[PDB]
Amino acid sequence: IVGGYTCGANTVPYQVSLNSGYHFCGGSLINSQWVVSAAHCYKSGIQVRLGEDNINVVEGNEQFISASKSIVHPSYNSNTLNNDIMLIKLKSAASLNSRVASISLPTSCASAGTQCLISGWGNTKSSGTSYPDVLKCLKAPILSDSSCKSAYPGQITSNMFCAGYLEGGKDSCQGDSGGPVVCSGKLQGIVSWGSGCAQKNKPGVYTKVCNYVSWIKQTIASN
Ligand SMILES: N=C(N)c1ccc(/C=N/O[C@H]2CCCCO2)cc1
Ligand SMILES: [Ca+2]
């Protein structure tokens, strides 16, 4: 997260870190045994880390649970990033409390102008590279589909939305991938892609979660 703020320990209780020896992606806990992330975060040997603030220090509220299976969206295209969504099942159910909690799925799509909270442990610099240890947060508005398409001609599908600031300076970044965009207590987006980070006229692009609720529910129901 570039141009954001320190969230505060366990203030984003649905935020997970995906770990394969090191943090490599975010995710969102949607019930005691399932996490939603980006398909471009797919790899084998994922351990899900819940209740994290400083990802480099055991602070007392962590739950580390290995994934039993991952399901990449049936229509994910890694070239265009269309359908950039993946479900991860935990080997055992997380113990849910105030600091480790699920986030609700949307019942309808959010509109341009809706203010959302974007979070993660990704790069904090728009030019260089600096990775934070503690969770970073950014409040950002959903942008109009027209401005999104104008920013990225030929690249925005109906399964994507832009959020952020066309002036630049405030954005998600590398390492935030797969993490949440939460608007009025609903998971509306997943950190997906962008041209660099926090660049002028290049806002963040996010997977449009409301399009996938049917798939998420039915997948969970049978797995
Ligand atoms: N500007 C953004 N909001 C932005 C930019 C980039 C990303 C993530 N990229 O993932 C890279 C790094 C490694 C995995 C695949 O390739 C997210 C948001
Ligand atoms: Ca920790």
UniProtKB/Swiss-Prot annotation:
Enzyme category, top tier: hydrolase
Catalytic activities: Preferential cleavage: Arg-|-Xaa, Lys-|-Xaa
SS bonds (residue pairs): C7-C137, C25-C41, C109-C210, C116-C183, C148-C162, C173-C197
Keyword hit for Calcium: yes
A GO CC term assigned to this protein in UniProt: serine protease inhibitor complex
Reported cofactor(s): Ca(2+)
Cofactor: how and how many bound: Binds 1 Ca(2+) ion per subunit.
Tissue: Synthesized in the acinar cells of the pancreas.
Gene3D superfamilies noted in UniProt: Trypsin-like serine proteases
Pfam families documented for this protein: Trypsin
Family: Belongs to the peptidase S1 family.
Name this polypeptide is given: Serine protease 1
Protein's organism: Bos taurus (Bovine)
